[PDB]
Amino acid sequence: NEVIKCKAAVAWEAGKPLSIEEIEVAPPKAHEVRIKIIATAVCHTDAYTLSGADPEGCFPVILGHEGAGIVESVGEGVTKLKAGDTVIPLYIPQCGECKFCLNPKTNLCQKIRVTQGKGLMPDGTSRFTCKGKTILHYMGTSTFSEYTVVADISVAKIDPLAPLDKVCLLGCGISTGYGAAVNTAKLEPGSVCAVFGLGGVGLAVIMGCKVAGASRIIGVDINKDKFARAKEFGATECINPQDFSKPIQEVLIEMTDGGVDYSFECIGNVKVMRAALEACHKGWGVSVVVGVAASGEEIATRPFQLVTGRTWKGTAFGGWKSVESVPKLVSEYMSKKIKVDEFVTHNLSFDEINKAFELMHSGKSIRTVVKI
Amino acid sequence: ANEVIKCKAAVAWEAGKPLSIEEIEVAPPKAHEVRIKIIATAVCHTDAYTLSGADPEGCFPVILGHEGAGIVESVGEGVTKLKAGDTVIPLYIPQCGECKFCLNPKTNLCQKIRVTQGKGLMPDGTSRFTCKGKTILHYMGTSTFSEYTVVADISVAKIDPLAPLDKVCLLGCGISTGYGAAVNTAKLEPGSVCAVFGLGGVGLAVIMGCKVAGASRIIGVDINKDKFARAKEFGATECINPQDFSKPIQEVLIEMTDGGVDYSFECIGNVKVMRAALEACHKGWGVSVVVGVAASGEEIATRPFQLVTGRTWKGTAFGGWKSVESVPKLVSEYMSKKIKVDEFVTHNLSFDEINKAFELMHSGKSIRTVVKI
Ligand SMILES: NC(=O)c1ccc[n+]([C@@H]2O[C@H](COP(=O)([O-])OP(=O)(O)OC[C@H]3O[C@@H](n4cnc5c(N)ncnc54)[C@H](O)[C@@H]3O)[C@@H](O)[C@H]2O)c1
Ligand SMILES: NC(=O)c1ccc[n+]([C@@H]2O[C@H](COP(=O)([O-])OP(=O)(O)OC[C@H]3O[C@@H](n4cnc5c(N)ncnc54)[C@H](O)[C@@H]3O)[C@@H](O)[C@H]2O)c1
Ligand SMILES: Cc1cc(C(N)=O)ccc1-n1c(CCC(=O)O)ccc1-c1ccc(-n2ccnc2)cc1
Ligand SMILES: Cc1cc(C(N)=O)ccc1-n1c(CCC(=O)O)ccc1-c1ccc(-n2ccnc2)cc1
Ligand SMILES: [K+]
Ligand SMILES: [K+]
Ligand SMILES: [Zn+2]
Ligand SMILES: [Zn+2]
Ligand SMILES: [Zn+2]
Ligand SMILES: [Zn+2]
């Protein structure tokens, strides 16, 4: 395999638009896979890292972690994947061998986390160069490029008939929200639910709640424009905290004769995380933190809330063991068990990638799919 | 029932003062009430919390006590499942069997009588206690610091009539709570690695539960090293003192378990330690159970990263036991030697020495002191 010259959206520094550049992509080393990215989407954390607020965000970097494509080539020792395979790259890998992969209670494979956090392949180097400069990887995926290189354990092999301009969304938001409901919460039929934040993650939670047979699904958002789509996904009603003088947890307790069976925070706001917990019913209430708060911020409550029977938990990528689960999720979409198309609110070409960031900031999008 | 009973009780006349052995009057039970002759009672931390005046819900004068065992003296109108002579433990968490909570297998927090109970009253909104012309309040629905108490009929567990009441009184709170925290709330699997913060009666019962469930490691944590010997006797595989280390206790535990424990239990009531107990749990699957009851208004905190990376924060009340059905089963486990009770009794006193039990509790020298009425 040879060096590939191709287009990528490079973030040279924080707080600036992405630069469409000509880059070089090195061939895959041992146990690496080079992927032709066919479609990618833009998510909140891409923007967060780009802003410079991320304490562990480093530049220059090729962002992007919601993608789908085709294996261009594989490195030495790779036998399970081959050129032509249809794939989704994974920011949570599955080595299948570490104590985390071997434990049915978690999906947090630890094999490559240190190098990945530093924007590096497992051997401690990057495959990206541009204008004489090394360009860092992001979240083990770097999908904002015509070609990326990932660890061989960061790859889900999927249905070759899957529409890649849709299933790229199973790389993050949809899988996370859906899994929060069905894996982390494991909510029972008839459950009363509250979902805080009605972006793609929140909608996917609602979707999961409906699949699980929830009786009541209350969407909560400060942006009432989000309500229509939430109802389409199955929210039985929607409320705006701004419309009430009382704290949102008191409103929810009032509405539900004690609080919800399950709540989901899909914002990353620590005050709302507390509200979501306190909005849960005494005795059996469970709150799942899905939102990723800014570093240093703390969640708080009175321990009485736990002693009186509420449970606080969280989720990472919906708890899915990624390599085994993502193909199954693609199969659920193909069989119309779950929705994917309904999350796509905008479509752009690669050169227009910055407009996807603009759409996010405005609050006008769920997911924008960028066609490479 | 029958008539008014004139007996002795330990009255708390006022916050911040010792208990006074007074001559009191105990009214006969009304409909769906049960009058119990208390044979043995013990003193628990929350009795002192209320006595101190620090409890915003504490009201005086009051007859305290909620760990007790006795014999039914008489029953009110409409009571059929209990009769004079039945061997019983009074329950601060009742089980009406009919409310939303009783009907839900995930909880034991019966709500049937909680409002009146919170006010120190029977379900009809009145007290059965008087002393020197004054109304004396009930406490935790139990008021065990009396020769005779009256409780709601849903606040009674009928137990093995061969059970020694100077031992099984302890199943009315501490032992049951700790044991249940392990086997009910955590439901730990065989082979689990556990940490127990606080090595009083509650912590010891957690250790007992972890051993019953087949934990591979049980790490006891206490700033009082005098607690270590009994903790090991109960099944602690090792014991550590936070004061012996320069770094936070959660870092210490992560180091000794290669990532953190599978299950942690806070058995103190300290919000800083509660955070530490959560953070000492293993990434991905760790579970921390809050058992300690913190002072009012105090808050627990952590970074949400701790939950997003797979730790779970829970709590428990009376070990999650649906009380009326479970406490007799817990007595049976004691009688069959599946669980320990006798080993929790470190001191024994007479009723007129009840204040010494409080002294022993605050000096750190006791686990449980049983007071013989
Ligand atoms: N845990 C994981 O594995 C994981 C995976 C993907 C995304 N996330 C996180 O999930 C969160 C949501 O992602 P998204 O793509 O849906 O974002 P989004 O911006 O599209 O949606 C967030 C929504 O929250 C609403 N909101 C903001 N403040 C609110 C408040 N005070 N009360 C009620 N609603 C409020 C906004 O109006 C918005 O609609 C982000 O924090 C993201 O980082 C976590
Ligand atoms: N949740 C419930 O239903 C329930 C039921 C019974 C008791 N409790 C609570 O459980 C807690 C413990 O009860 P107990 O009877 O065992 O009390 P205890 O006072 O006998 O035991 C507490 C132990 O914690 C230790 N300790 C104090 N600070 C510490 C620290 N910083 N680090 C490590 N250890 C520390 C003390 O040395 C003591 O041995 C109390 O708060 C009590 O109210 C709760
Ligand atoms: C999965 C992940 C990747 C990175 C990274 N930079 O590669 C940083 C944090 C996380 N991360 C971890 C740590 C995983 C571990 O330690 O094994 C737990 C949860 C996350 C995580 C962080 C962010 C998101 N996220 C938010 C929006 N889109 C994806 C999803 C998951
Ligand atoms: C069970 C109990 C009794 C009283 C009371 N004073 O009667 C107050 C709080 C609680 N309580 C509640 C009630 C909340 C509710 O049901 O809505 C939940 C948990 C408790 C509770 C309070 C204190 C203790 N405790 C601490 C030490 N010994 C017993 C154990 C449990
Ligand atoms: K569940
Ligand atoms: K368990
Ligand atoms: Zn994302
Ligand atoms: Zn692994
Ligand atoms: Zn009830
Ligand atoms: Zn107690």
Tab-separated table of all heavy atoms in Angstrom, chain A residues 99 103 105-106 108 110 188 257 262 274 281-282 284 298-301 303 306-308 311-312 314, chain B residues 100 104 106 109 111 189 258 263 275 282-285 298-302 307 309 313 315-316:
chain	number	residue	atom	x	y	z
A	99	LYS	N	-9.969	-6.797	30.186
A	99	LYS	CA	-10.928	-7.058	31.272
A	99	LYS	C	-12.279	-6.378	31.052
A	99	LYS	O	-13.307	-6.878	31.498
A	99	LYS	CB	-10.352	-6.689	32.652
A	99	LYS	CG	-10.074	-5.214	32.866
A	99	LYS	CD	-9.764	-4.914	34.334
A	99	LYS	CE	-9.049	-3.584	34.458
A	99	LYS	NZ	-8.736	-3.257	35.876
A	103	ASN	N	-15.971	-8.324	30.243
A	103	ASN	CA	-17.026	-8.087	31.228
A	103	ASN	C	-18.323	-7.663	30.544
A	103	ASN	O	-18.343	-6.638	29.860
A	103	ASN	CB	-16.579	-7.016	32.235
A	103	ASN	CG	-17.428	-7.004	33.502
A	103	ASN	OD1	-18.662	-7.004	33.446
A	103	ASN	ND2	-16.766	-6.993	34.654
A	105	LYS	N	-20.827	-6.255	31.614
A	105	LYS	CA	-21.430	-5.063	32.210
A	105	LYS	C	-20.911	-3.739	31.631
A	105	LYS	O	-21.415	-2.668	31.978
A	105	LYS	CB	-21.242	-5.070	33.735
A	105	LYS	CG	-21.938	-6.206	34.457
A	105	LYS	CD	-21.652	-6.147	35.951
A	105	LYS	CE	-22.516	-7.140	36.720
A	105	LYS	NZ	-22.397	-6.939	38.193
A	106	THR	N	-19.927	-3.808	30.740
A	106	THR	CA	-19.300	-2.597	30.213
A	106	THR	C	-18.912	-2.736	28.735
A	106	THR	O	-18.822	-3.847	28.209
A	106	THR	CB	-18.062	-2.190	31.065
A	106	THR	OG1	-17.559	-0.929	30.621
A	106	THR	CG2	-16.954	-3.234	30.969
A	108	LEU	N	-16.364	-0.390	27.681
A	108	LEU	CA	-15.249	0.545	27.689
A	108	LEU	C	-13.889	-0.130	27.497
A	108	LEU	O	-13.039	-0.093	28.386
A	108	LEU	CB	-15.277	1.409	28.957
A	108	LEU	CG	-16.459	2.379	29.127
A	108	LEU	CD1	-16.447	2.987	30.527
A	108	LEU	CD2	-16.463	3.480	28.064
A	110	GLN	N	-10.201	-0.820	26.892
A	110	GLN	CA	-9.097	0.047	27.327
A	110	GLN	C	-7.823	-0.103	26.506
A	110	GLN	O	-6.837	0.584	26.769
A	110	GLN	CB	-8.764	-0.200	28.803
A	110	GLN	CG	-9.940	0.035	29.736
A	110	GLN	CD	-10.253	1.499	29.951
A	110	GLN	OE1	-9.560	2.180	30.714
A	110	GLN	NE2	-11.306	1.994	29.296
A	188	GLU	N	-38.630	-1.238	31.377
A	188	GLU	CA	-39.662	-2.261	31.216
A	188	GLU	C	-40.870	-1.688	30.461
A	188	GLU	O	-41.096	-0.475	30.493
A	188	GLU	CB	-40.108	-2.778	32.594
A	188	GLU	CG	-38.989	-3.393	33.445
A	188	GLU	CD	-38.189	-2.360	34.251
A	188	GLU	OE1	-38.421	-1.135	34.116
A	188	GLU	OE2	-37.301	-2.783	35.017
A	257	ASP	N	-47.485	12.002	39.484
A	257	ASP	CA	-47.898	11.435	40.776
A	257	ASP	C	-46.697	10.823	41.534
A	257	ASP	O	-46.788	9.728	42.093
A	257	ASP	CB	-49.027	10.404	40.565
A	257	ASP	CG	-49.571	9.834	41.869
A	257	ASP	OD1	-50.055	10.615	42.719
A	257	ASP	OD2	-49.513	8.593	42.041
A	262	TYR	N	-37.936	6.431	34.721
A	262	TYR	CA	-36.626	6.642	34.099
A	262	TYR	C	-36.522	8.048	33.532
A	262	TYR	O	-37.442	8.532	32.857
A	262	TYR	CB	-36.365	5.612	32.978
A	262	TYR	CG	-36.345	4.184	33.480
A	262	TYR	CD1	-37.514	3.416	33.500
A	262	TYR	CD2	-35.163	3.610	33.964
A	262	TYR	CE1	-37.512	2.110	33.983
A	262	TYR	CE2	-35.145	2.310	34.443
A	262	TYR	CZ	-36.323	1.567	34.449
A	262	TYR	OH	-36.310	0.286	34.926
A	274	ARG	N	-28.954	17.108	37.827
A	274	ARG	CA	-29.537	17.053	39.158
A	274	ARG	C	-31.062	17.026	39.084
A	274	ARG	O	-31.708	16.232	39.786
A	274	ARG	CB	-29.091	18.240	40.009
A	274	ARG	CG	-29.720	18.222	41.387
A	274	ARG	CD	-29.253	19.386	42.225
A	274	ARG	NE	-29.709	19.228	43.603
A	274	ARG	CZ	-29.098	19.760	44.657
A	274	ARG	NH1	-27.994	20.487	44.491
A	274	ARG	NH2	-29.591	19.559	45.871
A	281	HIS	N	-39.048	8.976	40.411
A	281	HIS	CA	-39.932	8.520	41.478
A	281	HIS	C	-39.130	7.976	42.660
A	281	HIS	O	-38.129	7.293	42.475
A	281	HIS	CB	-40.863	7.422	40.941
A	281	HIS	CG	-42.155	7.299	41.694
A	281	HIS	ND1	-42.238	6.716	42.941
A	281	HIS	CD2	-43.412	7.691	41.377
A	281	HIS	CE1	-43.495	6.745	43.356
A	281	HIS	NE2	-44.227	7.327	42.422
A	282	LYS	N	-39.572	8.298	43.872
A	282	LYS	CA	-39.067	7.652	45.077
A	282	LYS	C	-39.169	6.126	44.940
A	282	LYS	O	-40.035	5.615	44.217
A	282	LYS	CB	-39.869	8.145	46.285
A	282	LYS	CG	-39.410	7.629	47.630
A	282	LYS	CD	-39.995	8.450	48.775
A	282	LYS	CE	-41.481	8.237	48.914
A	282	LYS	NZ	-42.046	9.097	50.000
A	284	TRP	N	-37.896	3.640	43.254
A	284	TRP	CA	-37.410	2.899	42.081
A	284	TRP	C	-36.878	3.749	40.925
A	284	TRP	O	-36.433	3.200	39.915
A	284	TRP	CB	-38.496	1.943	41.564
A	284	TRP	CG	-39.758	2.634	41.110
A	284	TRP	CD1	-39.974	3.262	39.903
A	284	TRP	CD2	-40.976	2.770	41.855
A	284	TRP	NE1	-41.253	3.775	39.861
A	284	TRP	CE2	-41.888	3.483	41.041
A	284	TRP	CE3	-41.387	2.358	43.133
A	284	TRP	CZ2	-43.191	3.784	41.462
A	284	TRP	CZ3	-42.693	2.658	43.549
A	284	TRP	CH2	-43.568	3.369	42.718
A	298	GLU	N	-19.391	19.841	38.427
A	298	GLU	CA	-19.843	18.762	39.297
A	298	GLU	C	-21.354	18.633	39.308
A	298	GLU	O	-22.075	19.629	39.206
A	298	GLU	CB	-19.327	18.975	40.726
A	298	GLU	CG	-17.819	18.878	40.845
A	298	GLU	CD	-17.326	18.887	42.278
A	298	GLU	OE1	-18.077	19.296	43.194
A	298	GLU	OE2	-16.169	18.480	42.480
A	299	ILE	N	-21.822	17.394	39.420
A	299	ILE	CA	-23.222	17.115	39.740
A	299	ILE	C	-23.374	16.989	41.251
A	299	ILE	O	-22.453	16.524	41.941
A	299	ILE	CB	-23.744	15.832	39.038
A	299	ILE	CG1	-22.864	14.616	39.355
A	299	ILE	CG2	-23.836	16.066	37.525
A	299	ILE	CD1	-23.452	13.280	38.933
A	300	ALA	N	-24.531	17.404	41.760
A	300	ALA	CA	-24.813	17.352	43.189
A	300	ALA	C	-26.264	16.970	43.458
A	300	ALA	O	-27.129	17.160	42.608
A	300	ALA	CB	-24.489	18.697	43.846
A	301	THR	N	-26.506	16.425	44.647
A	301	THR	CA	-27.850	16.211	45.172
A	301	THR	C	-27.714	15.928	46.666
A	301	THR	O	-26.597	15.798	47.176
A	301	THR	CB	-28.598	15.040	44.447
A	301	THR	OG1	-30.000	15.082	44.770
A	301	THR	CG2	-28.012	13.680	44.846
A	303	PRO	N	-28.026	13.215	49.569
A	303	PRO	CA	-27.957	11.747	49.529
A	303	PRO	C	-29.281	11.057	49.889
A	303	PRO	O	-29.473	9.887	49.556
A	303	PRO	CB	-26.866	11.411	50.552
A	303	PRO	CG	-26.755	12.621	51.423
A	303	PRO	CD	-27.074	13.785	50.543
A	306	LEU	N	-30.960	9.197	47.107
A	306	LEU	CA	-30.503	7.822	46.866
A	306	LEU	C	-30.975	6.854	47.952
A	306	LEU	O	-31.419	5.746	47.654
A	306	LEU	CB	-28.973	7.766	46.736
A	306	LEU	CG	-28.327	8.691	45.703
A	306	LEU	CD1	-26.818	8.448	45.641
A	306	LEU	CD2	-28.968	8.517	44.317
A	307	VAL	N	-30.880	7.280	49.213
A	307	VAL	CA	-31.356	6.475	50.335
A	307	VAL	C	-32.853	6.143	50.172
A	307	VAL	O	-33.291	5.045	50.523
A	307	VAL	CB	-31.052	7.169	51.704
A	307	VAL	CG1	-31.772	6.469	52.860
A	307	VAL	CG2	-29.542	7.204	51.961
A	308	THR	N	-33.618	7.079	49.607
A	308	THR	CA	-35.055	6.866	49.360
A	308	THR	C	-35.349	6.205	47.998
A	308	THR	O	-36.499	6.181	47.538
A	308	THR	CB	-35.898	8.156	49.561
A	308	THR	OG1	-35.457	9.183	48.658
A	308	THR	CG2	-35.763	8.658	50.997
A	311	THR	N	-31.665	5.896	41.678
A	311	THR	CA	-30.369	5.397	41.198
A	311	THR	C	-29.820	6.362	40.148
A	311	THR	O	-30.557	6.808	39.253
A	311	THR	CB	-30.526	3.999	40.569
A	311	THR	OG1	-31.009	3.085	41.557
A	311	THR	CG2	-29.195	3.477	39.985
A	312	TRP	N	-28.531	6.678	40.259
A	312	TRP	CA	-27.864	7.553	39.303
A	312	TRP	C	-26.863	6.739	38.498
A	312	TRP	O	-25.967	6.114	39.064
A	312	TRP	CB	-27.121	8.681	40.023
A	312	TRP	CG	-27.298	10.031	39.376
A	312	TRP	CD1	-27.725	10.287	38.098
A	312	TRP	CD2	-27.042	11.309	39.979
A	312	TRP	NE1	-27.761	11.647	37.876
A	312	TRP	CE2	-27.347	12.295	39.013
A	312	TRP	CE3	-26.587	11.716	41.248
A	312	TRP	CZ2	-27.217	13.671	39.275
A	312	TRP	CZ3	-26.460	13.077	41.511
A	312	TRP	CH2	-26.777	14.041	40.527
A	314	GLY	N	-24.892	6.337	34.216
A	314	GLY	CA	-24.495	7.019	33.000
A	314	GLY	C	-24.267	6.034	31.884
A	314	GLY	O	-24.322	4.820	32.087
B	100	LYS	N	-49.072	1.881	46.702
B	100	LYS	CA	-48.258	1.880	45.486
B	100	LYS	C	-46.873	1.267	45.723
B	100	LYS	O	-46.379	0.485	44.909
B	100	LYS	CB	-48.121	3.317	44.961
B	100	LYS	CG	-47.744	3.437	43.496
B	100	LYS	CD	-47.685	4.902	43.079
B	100	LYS	CE	-47.054	5.068	41.707
B	100	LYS	NZ	-47.064	6.491	41.258
B	104	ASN	N	-45.087	-2.573	44.667
B	104	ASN	CA	-43.941	-2.558	43.762
B	104	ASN	C	-42.753	-3.322	44.362
B	104	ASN	O	-42.231	-2.928	45.410
B	104	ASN	CB	-43.563	-1.103	43.433
B	104	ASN	CG	-42.605	-0.990	42.261
B	104	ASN	OD1	-41.633	-1.736	42.162
B	104	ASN	ND2	-42.873	-0.040	41.369
B	106	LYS	N	-39.736	-3.338	43.686
B	106	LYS	CA	-38.450	-2.626	43.681
B	106	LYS	C	-38.201	-1.773	44.934
B	106	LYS	O	-37.123	-1.194	45.083
B	106	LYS	CB	-38.310	-1.754	42.423
B	106	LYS	CG	-38.172	-2.536	41.120
B	106	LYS	CD	-38.099	-1.587	39.916
B	106	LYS	CE	-37.804	-2.343	38.619
B	106	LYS	NZ	-37.591	-1.414	37.472
B	109	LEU	N	-40.567	1.100	50.788
B	109	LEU	CA	-40.990	2.334	51.446
B	109	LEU	C	-42.515	2.524	51.478
B	109	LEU	O	-43.056	3.410	50.821
B	109	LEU	CB	-40.295	3.551	50.810
B	109	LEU	CG	-38.760	3.609	50.917
B	109	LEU	CD1	-38.198	4.797	50.139
B	109	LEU	CD2	-38.307	3.667	52.382
B	111	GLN	N	-45.989	3.864	52.262
B	111	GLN	CA	-46.383	5.257	52.496
B	111	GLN	C	-47.649	5.414	53.327
B	111	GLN	O	-48.062	6.534	53.609
B	111	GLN	CB	-46.594	5.977	51.158
B	111	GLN	CG	-45.367	5.967	50.269
B	111	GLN	CD	-44.221	6.783	50.830
B	111	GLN	OE1	-44.286	8.011	50.851
B	111	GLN	NE2	-43.161	6.109	51.275
B	189	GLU	N	-22.450	-10.520	43.278
B	189	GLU	CA	-22.231	-11.863	42.748
B	189	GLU	C	-21.071	-12.535	43.482
B	189	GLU	O	-20.208	-11.846	44.022
B	189	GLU	CB	-21.907	-11.781	41.251
B	189	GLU	CG	-23.001	-11.140	40.387
B	189	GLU	CD	-22.921	-9.618	40.329
B	189	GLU	OE1	-22.025	-9.019	40.972
B	189	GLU	OE2	-23.779	-9.013	39.640
B	258	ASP	N	-6.537	-2.764	41.460
B	258	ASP	CA	-6.272	-2.641	40.021
B	258	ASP	C	-7.473	-2.026	39.280
B	258	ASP	O	-7.994	-2.598	38.320
B	258	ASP	CB	-5.860	-3.998	39.416
B	258	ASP	CG	-5.292	-3.873	38.002
B	258	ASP	OD1	-4.507	-2.930	37.738
B	258	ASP	OD2	-5.625	-4.732	37.152
B	263	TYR	N	-18.077	-3.346	44.298
B	263	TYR	CA	-19.134	-2.764	45.132
B	263	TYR	C	-18.526	-2.040	46.318
B	263	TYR	O	-17.625	-2.571	46.973
B	263	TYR	CB	-20.091	-3.849	45.638
B	263	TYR	CG	-20.832	-4.547	44.533
B	263	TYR	CD1	-20.331	-5.725	43.973
B	263	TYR	CD2	-22.018	-4.013	44.017
B	263	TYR	CE1	-20.996	-6.363	42.937
B	263	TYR	CE2	-22.688	-4.641	42.983
B	263	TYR	CZ	-22.172	-5.817	42.449
B	263	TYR	OH	-22.840	-6.451	41.422
B	275	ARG	N	-18.787	10.412	48.329
B	275	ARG	CA	-18.115	10.663	47.059
B	275	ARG	C	-16.924	9.715	46.877
B	275	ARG	O	-16.733	9.137	45.800
B	275	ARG	CB	-17.666	12.123	46.947
B	275	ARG	CG	-16.825	12.412	45.691
B	275	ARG	CD	-16.442	13.873	45.585
B	275	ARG	NE	-15.949	14.189	44.242
B	275	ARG	CZ	-15.930	15.408	43.715
B	275	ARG	NH1	-16.367	16.450	44.415
B	275	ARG	NH2	-15.474	15.587	42.481
B	282	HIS	N	-14.811	0.502	40.554
B	282	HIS	CA	-14.176	0.225	39.276
B	282	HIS	C	-14.908	0.939	38.148
B	282	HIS	O	-16.141	1.000	38.132
B	282	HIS	CB	-14.168	-1.286	39.006
B	282	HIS	CG	-13.071	-1.728	38.086
B	282	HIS	ND1	-13.080	-1.462	36.732
B	282	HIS	CD2	-11.932	-2.420	38.326
B	282	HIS	CE1	-11.993	-1.967	36.178
B	282	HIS	NE2	-11.282	-2.560	37.121
B	283	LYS	N	-14.136	1.492	37.218
B	283	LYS	CA	-14.669	2.001	35.958
B	283	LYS	C	-15.489	0.898	35.280
B	283	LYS	O	-15.204	-0.296	35.445
B	283	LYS	CB	-13.498	2.437	35.070
B	283	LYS	CG	-13.833	3.078	33.727
B	283	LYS	CD	-12.519	3.422	33.048
B	283	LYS	CE	-12.703	4.195	31.777
B	283	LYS	NZ	-11.358	4.443	31.177
B	284	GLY	N	-16.530	1.298	34.554
B	284	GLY	CA	-17.301	0.359	33.743
B	284	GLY	C	-18.457	-0.329	34.447
B	284	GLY	O	-19.547	-0.427	33.888
B	285	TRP	N	-18.242	-0.803	35.674
B	285	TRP	CA	-19.276	-1.612	36.335
B	285	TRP	C	-19.421	-1.434	37.852
B	285	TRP	O	-20.235	-2.127	38.473
B	285	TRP	CB	-19.054	-3.100	36.030
B	285	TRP	CG	-17.750	-3.633	36.578
B	285	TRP	CD1	-17.482	-3.990	37.876
B	285	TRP	CD2	-16.544	-3.866	35.842
B	285	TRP	NE1	-16.181	-4.419	37.991
B	285	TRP	CE2	-15.583	-4.358	36.757
B	285	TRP	CE3	-16.176	-3.695	34.497
B	285	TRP	CZ2	-14.281	-4.698	36.370
B	285	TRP	CZ3	-14.878	-4.034	34.111
B	285	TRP	CH2	-13.946	-4.525	35.048
B	298	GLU	N	-26.916	18.673	53.830
B	298	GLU	CA	-25.625	18.312	53.242
B	298	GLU	C	-25.824	17.639	51.892
B	298	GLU	O	-26.791	16.911	51.693
B	298	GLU	CB	-24.833	17.393	54.165
B	298	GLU	CG	-24.584	17.991	55.542
B	298	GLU	CD	-23.348	17.445	56.197
B	298	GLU	OE1	-22.391	17.094	55.472
B	298	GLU	OE2	-23.317	17.384	57.447
B	299	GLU	N	-24.909	17.899	50.966
B	299	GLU	CA	-25.042	17.377	49.608
B	299	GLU	C	-23.882	16.469	49.247
B	299	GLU	O	-22.769	16.660	49.734
B	299	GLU	CB	-25.184	18.527	48.603
B	299	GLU	CG	-26.547	19.236	48.704
B	299	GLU	CD	-26.765	20.337	47.677
B	299	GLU	OE1	-25.844	20.660	46.895
B	299	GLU	OE2	-27.884	20.893	47.662
B	300	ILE	N	-24.160	15.460	48.422
B	300	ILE	CA	-23.104	14.679	47.783
B	300	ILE	C	-22.786	15.276	46.411
B	300	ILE	O	-23.658	15.861	45.764
B	300	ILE	CB	-23.471	13.169	47.640
B	300	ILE	CG1	-24.863	12.990	47.018
B	300	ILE	CG2	-23.370	12.470	49.000
B	300	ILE	CD1	-25.182	11.559	46.590
B	301	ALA	N	-21.533	15.135	45.987
B	301	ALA	CA	-21.096	15.646	44.694
B	301	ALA	C	-20.113	14.686	44.047
B	301	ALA	O	-19.451	13.914	44.732
B	301	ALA	CB	-20.457	17.028	44.850
B	302	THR	N	-20.038	14.735	42.720
B	302	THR	CA	-18.966	14.084	41.963
B	302	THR	C	-18.942	14.743	40.586
B	302	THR	O	-19.760	15.619	40.312
B	302	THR	CB	-19.164	12.548	41.841
B	302	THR	OG1	-17.962	11.949	41.338
B	302	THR	CG2	-20.348	12.197	40.904
B	307	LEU	N	-20.052	8.686	36.320
B	307	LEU	CA	-21.212	7.883	35.911
B	307	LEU	C	-21.176	7.531	34.425
B	307	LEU	O	-21.510	6.407	34.041
B	307	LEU	CB	-22.528	8.599	36.252
B	307	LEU	CG	-22.692	9.133	37.680
B	307	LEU	CD1	-24.065	9.811	37.866
B	307	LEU	CD2	-22.486	8.018	38.707
B	309	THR	N	-18.614	7.017	32.672
B	309	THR	CA	-17.646	5.917	32.553
B	309	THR	C	-18.029	4.675	33.378
B	309	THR	O	-17.185	3.832	33.668
B	309	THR	CB	-16.181	6.363	32.820
B	309	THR	OG1	-16.049	6.887	34.150
B	309	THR	CG2	-15.769	7.433	31.821
B	313	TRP	N	-24.605	5.017	41.295
B	313	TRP	CA	-24.826	5.499	42.663
B	313	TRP	C	-26.220	5.104	43.139
B	313	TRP	O	-27.227	5.488	42.525
B	313	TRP	CB	-24.653	7.021	42.746
B	313	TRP	CG	-23.816	7.488	43.917
B	313	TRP	CD1	-23.483	6.768	45.042
B	313	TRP	CD2	-23.219	8.777	44.077
B	313	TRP	NE1	-22.714	7.537	45.887
B	313	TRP	CE2	-22.531	8.770	45.317
B	313	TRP	CE3	-23.191	9.941	43.289
B	313	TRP	CZ2	-21.823	9.883	45.787
B	313	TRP	CZ3	-22.491	11.051	43.761
B	313	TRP	CH2	-21.810	11.010	44.997
B	315	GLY	N	-28.698	3.918	46.926
B	315	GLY	CA	-28.856	3.998	48.372
B	315	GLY	C	-29.804	2.911	48.837
B	315	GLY	O	-30.350	2.151	48.024
B	316	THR	N	-30.006	2.832	50.143
B	316	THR	CA	-30.898	1.824	50.713
B	316	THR	C	-31.538	2.345	51.990
B	316	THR	O	-30.967	3.195	52.671
B	316	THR	CB	-30.173	0.463	50.961
B	316	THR	OG1	-31.138	-0.558	51.253
B	316	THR	CG2	-29.165	0.552	52.122
